[PDB]
Amino acid sequence: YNVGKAEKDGEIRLKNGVAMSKEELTREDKNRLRRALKRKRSKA
Amino acid sequence: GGGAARRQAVDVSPLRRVNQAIALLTIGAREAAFRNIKTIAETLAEELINAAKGSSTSYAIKKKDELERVAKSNR
Amino acid sequence: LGESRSEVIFNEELDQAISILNDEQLILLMKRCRDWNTNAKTHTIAQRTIRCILMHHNIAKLSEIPGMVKIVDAIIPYTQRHFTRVDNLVEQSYILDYALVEMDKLF
Amino acid sequence: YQRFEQAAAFGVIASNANCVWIPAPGQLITSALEDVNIWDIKTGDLVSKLSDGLPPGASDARGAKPAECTYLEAHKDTDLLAVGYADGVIKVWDLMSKTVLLNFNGHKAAITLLQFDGTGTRLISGSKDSNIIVWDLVGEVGLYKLRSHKDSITGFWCQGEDWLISTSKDGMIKLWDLKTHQCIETHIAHTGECWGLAVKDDLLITTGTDSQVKIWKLDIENDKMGGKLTEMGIFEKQSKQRGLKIEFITNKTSFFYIQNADKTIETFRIRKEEEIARGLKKREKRLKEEEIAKSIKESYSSFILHPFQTIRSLYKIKSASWTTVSSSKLELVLTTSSNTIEYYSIPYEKRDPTSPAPLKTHTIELQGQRTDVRSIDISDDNKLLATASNGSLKIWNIKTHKCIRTFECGYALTCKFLPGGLLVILGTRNGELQLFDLASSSLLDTIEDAHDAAIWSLDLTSDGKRLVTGSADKTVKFWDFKVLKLHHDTTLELTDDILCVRVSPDDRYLAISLLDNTVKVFFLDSMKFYLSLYGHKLPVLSIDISFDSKMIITSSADKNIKIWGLDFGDCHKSLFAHQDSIMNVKFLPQSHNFFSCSKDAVVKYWDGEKFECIQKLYAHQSEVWALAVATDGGFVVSSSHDHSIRIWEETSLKAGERLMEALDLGIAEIEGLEAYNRDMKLWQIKPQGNAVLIAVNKTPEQYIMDTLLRIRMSQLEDALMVMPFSYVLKFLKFIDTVMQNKTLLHSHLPLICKNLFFIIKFNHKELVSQKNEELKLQINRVKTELRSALKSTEDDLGFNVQGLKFVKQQWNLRHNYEFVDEYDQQEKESNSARKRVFGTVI
RNA sequence: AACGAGGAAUUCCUAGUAAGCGCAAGUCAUCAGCUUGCGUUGAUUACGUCCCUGCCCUUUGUACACACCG
Numbered sequence A: 001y002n003v004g005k006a007e008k009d010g011e012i013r014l015k016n017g018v019a020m021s022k023e024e025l026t027r028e029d030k031n032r033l034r035r036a037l038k039r040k041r042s043k044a
Numbered sequence B: 001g002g003g004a005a006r007r008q009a010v011d012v013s014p015l016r017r018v019n020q021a022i023a024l025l026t027i028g029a030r031e032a033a034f035r036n037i038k039t040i041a042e043t044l045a046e047e048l049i050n051a052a053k054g055s056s057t058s059y060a061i062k063k064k065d066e067l068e069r070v071a072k073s074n075r
Numbered sequence C: 001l002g003e004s005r006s007e008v009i010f011n012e013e014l015d016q017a018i019s020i021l022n023d024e025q026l027i028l029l030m031k032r033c034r035d036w037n038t039n040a041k042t043h044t045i046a047q048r049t050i051r052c053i054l055m056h057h058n059i060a061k062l063s064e065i066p067g068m069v070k071i072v073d074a075i076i077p078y079t080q081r082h083f084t085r086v087d088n089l090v091e092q093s094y095i096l097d098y099a100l101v102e103m104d105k106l107f
Numbered sequence D: 001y002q003r004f005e006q007a008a009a010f011g012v013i014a015s016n017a018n019c020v021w022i023p024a025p026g027q028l029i030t031s032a033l034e035d036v037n038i039w040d041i042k043t044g045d046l047v048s049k050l051s052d053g054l055p056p057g058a059s060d061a062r063g064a065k066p067a068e069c070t071y072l073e074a075h076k077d078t079d080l081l082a083v084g085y086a087d088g089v090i091k092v093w094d095l096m097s098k099t100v101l102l103n104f105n106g107h108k109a110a111i112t113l114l115q116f117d118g119t120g121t122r123l124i125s126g127s128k129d130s131n132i133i134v135w136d137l138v139g140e141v142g143l144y145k146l147r148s149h150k151d152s153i154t155g156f157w158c159q160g161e162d163w164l165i166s167t168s169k170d171g172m173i174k175l176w177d178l179k180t181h182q183c184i185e186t187h188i189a190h191t192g193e194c195w196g197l198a199v200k201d202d203l204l205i206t207t208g209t210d211s212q213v214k215i216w217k218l219d220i221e222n223d224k225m226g227g228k229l230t231e232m233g234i235f236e237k238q239s240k241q242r243g244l245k246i247e248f249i250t251n252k253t254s255f256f257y258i259q260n261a262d263k264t265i266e267t268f269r270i271r272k273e274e275e276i277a278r279g280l281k282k283r284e285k286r287l288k289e290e291e292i293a294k295s296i297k298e299s300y301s302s303f304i305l306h307p308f309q310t311i312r313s314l315y316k317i318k319s320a321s322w323t324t325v326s327s328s329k330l331e332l333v334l335t336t337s338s339n340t341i342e343y344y345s346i347p348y349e350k351r352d353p354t355s356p357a358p359l360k361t362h363t364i365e366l367q368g369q370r371t372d373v374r375s376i377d378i379s380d381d382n383k384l385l386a387t388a389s390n391g392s393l394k395i396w397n398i399k400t401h402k403c404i405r406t407f408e409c410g411y412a413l414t415c416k417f418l419p420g421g422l423l424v425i426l427g428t429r430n431g432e433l434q435l436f437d438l439a440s441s442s443l444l445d446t447i448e449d450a451h452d453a454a455i456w457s458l459d460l461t462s463d464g465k466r467l468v469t470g471s472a473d474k475t476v477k478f479w480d481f482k483v484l485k486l487h488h489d490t491t492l493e494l495t496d497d498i499l500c501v502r503v504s505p506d507d508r509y510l511a512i513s514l515l516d517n518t519v520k521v522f523f524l525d526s527m528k529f530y531l532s533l534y535g536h537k538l539p540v541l542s543i544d545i546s547f548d549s550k551m552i553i554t555s556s557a558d559k560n561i562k563i564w565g566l567d568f569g570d571c572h573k574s575l576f577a578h579q580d581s582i583m584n585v586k587f588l589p590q591s592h593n594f595f596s597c598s599k600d601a602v603v604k605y606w607d608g609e610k611f612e613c614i615q616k617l618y619a620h621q622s623e624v625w626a627l628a629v630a631t632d633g634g635f636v637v638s639s640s641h642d643h644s645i646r647i648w649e650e651t652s653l654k655a656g657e658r659l660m661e662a663l664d665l666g667i668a669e670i671e672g673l674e675a676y677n678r679d680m681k682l683w684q685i686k687p688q689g690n691a692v693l694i695a696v697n698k699t700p701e702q703y704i705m706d707t708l709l710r711i712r713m714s715q716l717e718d719a720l721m722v723m724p725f726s727y728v729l730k731f732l733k734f735i736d737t738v739m740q741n742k743t744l745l746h747s748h749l750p751l752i753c754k755n756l757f758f759i760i761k762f763n764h765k766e767l768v769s770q771k772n773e774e775l776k777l778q779i780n781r782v783k784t785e786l787r788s789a790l791k792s793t794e795d796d797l798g799f800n801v802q803g804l805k806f807v808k809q810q811w812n813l814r815h816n817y818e819f820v821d822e823y824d825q826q827e828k829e830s831n832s833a834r835k836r837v838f839g840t841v842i
Numbered sequence E: 001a002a003c004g005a006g007g008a009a010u011u012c013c014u015a016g017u018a019a020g021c022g023c024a025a026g027u028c029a030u031c032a033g034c035u036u037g038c039g040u041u042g043a044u045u046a047c048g049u050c051c052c053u054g055c056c057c058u059u060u061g062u063a064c065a066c067a068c069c070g
Helices: A027-043 B014-032 B040-053 B059-073 C012-019 C023-038 C043-055 C059-064 C068-106 D273-288 D291-304 D657-683 D691-696 D700-710 D716-722 D725-740 D749-762 D764-769 D773-815 D822-832
Strands: A011-013 A019-021 D004-010 D020-022 D027-032 D035-039 D046-050 D069-075 D080-085 D089-094 D111-117 D122-127 D132-136 D141-146 D155-159 D163-168 D172-177 D182-188 D194-199 D203-208 D212-218 D229-236 D243-250 D254-260 D264-270 D305-312 D319-325 D329-335 D341-347 D373-379 D383-388 D392-397 D403-406 D412-418 D423-428 D432-436 D443-447 D455-460 D466-471 D475-482 D485-493 D498-503 D509-514 D518-523 D531-534 D540-545 D551-556 D560-565 D570-576 D582-587 D593-598 D603-607 D612-617 D624-629 D636-640 D644-650
Touching: B014 B040, B014 B059, B040 B059, C012 C043, C023 C043, C023 C068, C043 C068, C043 D773, C059 C068, C059 D773, C068 D749, C068 D764, C068 D773, D020 D069, D020 D319, D027 D069, D035 D069, D069 D111, D080 D111, D080 D122, D089 D111, D111 D155, D122 D155, D155 D194, D163 D194, D172 D194, D182 D229, D194 D243, D203 D243, D212 D291, D229 D291, D243 D319, D254 D319, D273 D291, D291 D305, D305 D341, D373 D412, D373 D624, D373 D636, D383 D412, D383 D423, D392 D423, D412 D455, D423 D455, D432 D455, D443 D485, D455 D498, D466 D498, D475 D498, D498 D540, D509 D540, D518 D540, D540 D582, D551 D582, D560 D582, D582 D624, D593 D624, D603 D636, D657 D700, D657 D725, D691 D700, D700 D725, D700 D749, D716 D749, D725 D749, D725 D764, D725 D773, D749 D764, D749 D773
Parallel strands: none
Antiparallel strands: A011 A019, D004 D644, D020 D027, D027 D035, D035 D046, D069 D080, D080 D089, D111 D122, D122 D132, D132 D141, D155 D163, D163 D172, D172 D182, D194 D203, D203 D212, D212 D229, D243 D254, D254 D264, D264 D305, D319 D329, D329 D341, D373 D383, D383 D392, D392 D403, D412 D423, D423 D432, D432 D443, D455 D466, D466 D475, D475 D485, D498 D509, D509 D518, D518 D531, D540 D551, D551 D560, D560 D570, D582 D593, D593 D603, D603 D612, D624 D636, D636 D644
């Protein structure tokens, strides 16, 4: 078992076991998370 | 330091001591027999004997005490 | 937890709330506990909620709730790894004791 | 080479913004665009008007849209006028000194609500982003900021310093407490947005989108979801449109109004406790005539509310406010979409509105142009001729900027100025051709039915004897000026319709710009089809031909000037600019320098002999519709869709070291405080808290803990090696203080253990050869505490391992229908066990 | 009559290297004001560092244990 990418749609699972939702996030951190996923999908 | 420059005092490695002592001794001998009636072998002999005497008339001896007192002055 | 470092596991109010937790809630709690234990740092919080559930539920009922075999196979070996690391930490606490005993050997 | 700058501006009575009223009615302040307007009601003359510090039109002024005065707020007791500009800039002015005193910068979006306790000089602002900023004026910075809504700010009420209530278009009402500096309450107001927030000390009203207001009860009661705010009143149908703004006053019965979307202001009244008891018991009589009591609970809204009346104004309305007196007359200041101030009256005796229509008094419409301006003209270095779509023709004298006379025709399209007699001639797309005077009577002549489609262009020879007209019924009609009436010289047809026309200024050639994307050119005395200009790729919109009639310039709506030569009919040079689409271009009367105006709020000034834009002009923000160049001096006149007119005249420490010095300070403070405690033991001074500790708000323990966590996991070993022995001793004392403060331990036990063991194992020999009883006791205590903590965590780990192994074993026992055939058991458990695949190299 | 080892700036180099000494040739491009071969003699001082000067690379474990961080 490694931690899988998130099953349901409104929640974000990272690989170090800190789960987040799109409901408990402040919008700047939402923006940061989108940028991090951007650089990840930019390599991949 | 970025402009406020100075001289600071540190210790010195044994190899640096040996190389420094030897270079100083020979350079003192050569500068003694630079423009003189004596030759390098003679004045190096006198300079070495006074150096082992440690008696304050040898080129390397003067330079050595000058070095350590520079360190003392801007400790 | 930062509060209750000061068989009580928490504030007793919170303990009773966990004991009145429901089934779908329990599966969710075990799942997020599984994540938190997968990380190698938050396993303290993972262990506290596991042990609180274990001390305040019926084990037969827990097992008979579906899916728990999946989440327990996910949980167990990470906890064993944490255990052997804690073992190494104690064994180095003994170098600390050795330094003590040699200092007073000297005195 | 002559630069140009704007001198002045015209006609902007009240922009899309608020309006404020100083009592002497009293005098009035409204918003122009980067100007504030202040004048009187009795008369209708500009007392004063305020703009920014530096003049627009230079290279010093930024080549940008100017941020319009979106909001403005007056305090007579401080005599201050806080103004707010749409990119989000807050300035303040006066009326007597009329100077800008201090300028804030806190917003990225258009400024919406500006309320200040100038009593305490605490200015509270909200722009079109979501965050509400509390500024302190005399500190000239924001005091702090509250950011919790999500769309924008549209409802706002601050009370004392204690309470703040917000309503936002993300349709929710929230309530912050400012001392706790954060949010307490949240409720959902309406379906979509919620706009209007009005407060009386117990009774509060909000309007949303569905012509619907809700009445709310406010307390300071203890509850978190309840207690503070409840949801009593529901009222429907002020008017079908959504509700936009509320304002609340009294003398004593109380009154409020809500400005709707359209031309309507709905004003209501709330009565008093006597009539409340009357209505309660009378409805109870109707009841006896608790089901119907919860029906009373429904009707509570209209039970307290009472509609005073409606105001139905002219075409649109944009801002509104109160002027009350005497409990007999209630007058109202209003300002509309187009440039009109309208001051209204409601008479009453607490009982009746006394008239079905309130008196629409004190209208100011003189200097405003009251519609979308369509064209412009000049009159021989003395007059300026603006023609607007009610047929509002206005002559202006350039020295004094005021007005002379006024006509009406309705929706016109084209105008010209005739210097013979100073006549002005007009044409309307309802295809008619009219013409009027200045010093004689109003109407000179009305050629009714010019054509049976839209006429589009109209120009004049230097003779004044022949006018030229272009009408989109495929016709171009030339007229002669009979001695002062008119006759039709000629009518020439085409197969496509005329979009525009012009003649030569030196009276040689004749150009006709056509919808098949072309420019035909005939002669003036022959109509011989001398030239054909092709290649604009869109319908060409405007025409000019220079002073000697040698250079043609043509404007088409695909955003490029095209420059042509009357020698043979070739395009000299094309020139792409003006990002929206060009509206009109004109030369200068003297040489080949020209001005272009376009649908993106720019006016660019160009040389043709060099083919460049020498100047770019950023006066206003709306589409530029009309452009006029002066006859002799050459000043520039521009009319823009925001009903605005403009005139222009010419002129580093390393890891280890950081840890050591931070540990140094922390151990200094801790040892000082322990000296303090033992000195208190002798008493049976507190050493001063360091700036770093009390400012970062840290215990020394978490402070050293912070610098350890900051040092990354690859420089740690070099750091712990390079620290020397005295700092090692201070490290041990730090650990013992953590063992006193147990709760900082259990979140950093691994880091503590690894660092401690490496330090001792390296620096072992000196530390064990030392002798110090405090060191012995420190080692003893940290040993005991570390054993307790580590064995605690080990207890938890092994406990839960054993428990879950038992649980899984119990599941396997209960549900594992076993195969006694051991080979089958091997095969089943192996082919149903977990598989996992990796790619090996062979 | 200039001239006693050649200032300010500036360029390069860490072992059969700097430097010194000569003997030979003259190879389809270059070189005779020289160019290239070969042998002789053979050193002082660094062999660490990113602190300055600049330069690059990486900021996503992705690769399969244990470990490390997260």
